[PDB]
């Protein structure tokens, strides 16, 4: 019916709340909290025929340390997105002046827009998200523990305290469910907590690669 | 998991592929426990945590199922 | 043919033969499977 | 590394005290001097226990570290537990 | 290198590695699977 | 600690295992000292309380006074050490110890 999809975007929407909110962007406690009436009350009832469409509920907010460190969230119109909806967004983030955004897919890319993520990554950070990689926070899971983005200074120190090398470290890839999550980057470093039925707690760091 | 009236923090598979895919390297190394700990324990024996811990640990400090 | 190498080392981390860290500590712990025992938390079941 | 900033543990290992036996065992058998009255024993490897207990093997552990630094420990620093 | 025999384990070990050396002081290590303590000179 | 362990154990389930059986520890205490349990007891409850901390200060795991090795430390120890201040209370060596 047309209320599923009013039921997926803003399950998406509650998800994205709660990855800016850990990115450690300022999100508002009422947005995270939204529930569907309230949703439906801001965006309406149906998409199809109605006011919620794609991009309407484009999504901006701000880095808690730094009010000009800013992201965009895009829904695209296109269900498989191509250079042309990129590049304006692109566009949008020359103006706005915003150097990362995400792009919730609906279904899909063409190749060169995959490519063009990279083509311009040094540039304009974009990170796809699949419409159903988002129906559902997987840090909520009972099996995925308490990951925190480590500082540089954090890692030095690290590196010092167990006279480690960044090679020694156990690895997790780029693209873990988890990595994308917190939106981490080659080099950085994740100081994994989770609870030991041995010790009571362990603490576990991954570098990303 | 994306379902309604699903519970998506319990809900579990004993395909740990799938595991892997949807919730990442860390879920792996508990669920892998889970899974070993389960064919050990369904016959009323028991191993010390730190066996199973250390094999989970190796097959997994690589960043993926090794 | 995997494990053989992965050790205690006398920084009482666990390392492979590369001396890529396994765990920060044995068992997360730094004990001997051979010592412990099994006992009872006592506070975690009594009513408030 | 110096006596001081030694971050390995004081007690002797069961590796340690089995080898640090051996090998004073060998040099007993090879006529190296004894540093304990032995009372009549005759078996270098009694003799090497006996001078274990108490603290007298002449010998020194160099624990190496991971990173490839290494402690130095004399047999009778360590805590020494059969 | 030198090579000491346990019997000179004795106080004068340290005389007897350069009186031997004099015929022929670093850290004297023990061979594993021998009494001999080698020395570099 | 018991706010600590419910999370740790959220089925409730008491068997853990440990290093040092503390019940063994204490009933062979009461069997070496000839203890009579009828009788009130000359164990200040202080020294229970500091005798505790003073204890905690010495299962150490990880060494060093630095921030993430202390850390560590209090990971390493956490279970026990909520074990350990579970029994070794001032109360039950007076009501039943």
């Given at each position: 019916d047309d209320e599923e999809e009013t039921y997926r975007l803003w399950k998406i929407r509650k998800t994205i709340m709660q990855l800016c909110h850990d990115r450690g962007y300022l999100v508002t406690q009422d947005e995270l909290d939204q529930t569907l009436e309230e949703f439906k009350a801001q965006f309406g009832d149906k998409p199809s025929e109605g006011r919620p469409r794609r991009t309407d509920l484009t999504v901006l907010v701000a880095h808690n340390d730094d009010p000009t460190d800013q992201m965009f969230v895009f829904f695209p119109e296109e269900p498989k997105v191509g250079i042309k909806t990129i590049k304006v967004y692109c566009q949008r983030m020359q103006e706005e002046n915003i150097t990362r955004a995400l792009i919730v897919v609906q279904q899909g890319m063409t190749p060169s827009a995959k490519q063009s993520l990279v083509d311009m990554a040094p540039k304009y950070i974009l990170e796809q998200f699949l419409q159903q990689e988002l129906l559902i926070n997987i840090t909520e899971h009972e099996l995925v523990p308490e990951h925190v983005v480590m500082t540089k200074e954090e890692v030095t120190e690290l590196l010092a305290r167990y006279k480690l090398r960044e090679n020694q470290l156990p690895r997790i890839q780029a693209g873990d469910p988890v990595a994308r999550y917190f939106g981490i980057k080659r080099g950085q470093v994740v100081k994994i907590i989770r609870p030991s039925e041995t010790a009571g707690r362990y603490i576990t760091y991954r570098l990303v690669q | 998991l994306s379902e309604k009236d699903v519970d998506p923090v319990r809900t579990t598979s004993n395909d740990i592929v799938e595991i892997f895919t949807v919730l990442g390297i860390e879920a792996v190394r508990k669920a892998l426990e889970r899974e070993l700990y389960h064919v050990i324990s369904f016959d009323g024996s028991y191993v010390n945590y730190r066996h199973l811990a250390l094999l989970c640990d190796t097959m997994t400090c690589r960043g993926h199922l090794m | 043919k995997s494990m053989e190498s992965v050790m205690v080392k006398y920084d009482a981390t666990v390392r492979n033969s590369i001396n890529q860290v396994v765990q920060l500590r044995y068992g997360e712990d730094?004990?001997?499977?051979?010592s412990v025992e099994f006992q009872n938390l006592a506070t975690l079941k009594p009513s408030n | 590394q110096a006596n001081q900033k030694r971050i390995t543990t004081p007690y002797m290992t069961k590796y340690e005290r089995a080898r640090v036996l051996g090998t004073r065992a060998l040099q007993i058998a090879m006529c190296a001097p004894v540093?304990?009255?032995?009372?009549?024993?005759?078996d270098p490897l009694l003799i090497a226990m006996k001078e274990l207990k108490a603290r007298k093997i002449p010998i020194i552990i160099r624990r190496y570290l991971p990173d490839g630094s290494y402690e130095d420990w004399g047999v009778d620093e360590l805590i020494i537990s059969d | 290198e030198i090579l000491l025999h346990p019997?000179?384990?004795?106080?004068?070990l340290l005389n007897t590695v350069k009186q031997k050396l004099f015929t022929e002081i670093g850290a004297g290590v023990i061979q594993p699977g021998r009494g001999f303590v080698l020395y570099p000179v | 600690d018991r706010e600590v362990l419910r999370v740790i154990f959220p089925t409730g389930d008491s068997k853990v295992v440990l290093p040092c059986n503390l019940l063994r520890m204490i009933w062979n205490a009461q069997k070496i000292f000839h203890i009579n349990p009828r009788l009130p007891s000359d164990l200040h409850p202080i020294k229970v309380v500091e005798g505790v901390k003073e204890l905690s200060k010495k299962l150490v795991i990880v060494n060093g006074d630095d921030p993430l090795s202390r850390q560590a430390q209090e990971n390493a120890t956490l279970l026990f050490n909520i074990h350990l201040r579970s029994t070794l209370c001032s109360r039950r060596m007076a009501e039943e110890f």
């Open positions: - | - | 730094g004990l001997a499977g051979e | 540093m304990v009255e032995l009372e009549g024993e005759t | 019997r000179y384990f004795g106080p004068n | -």
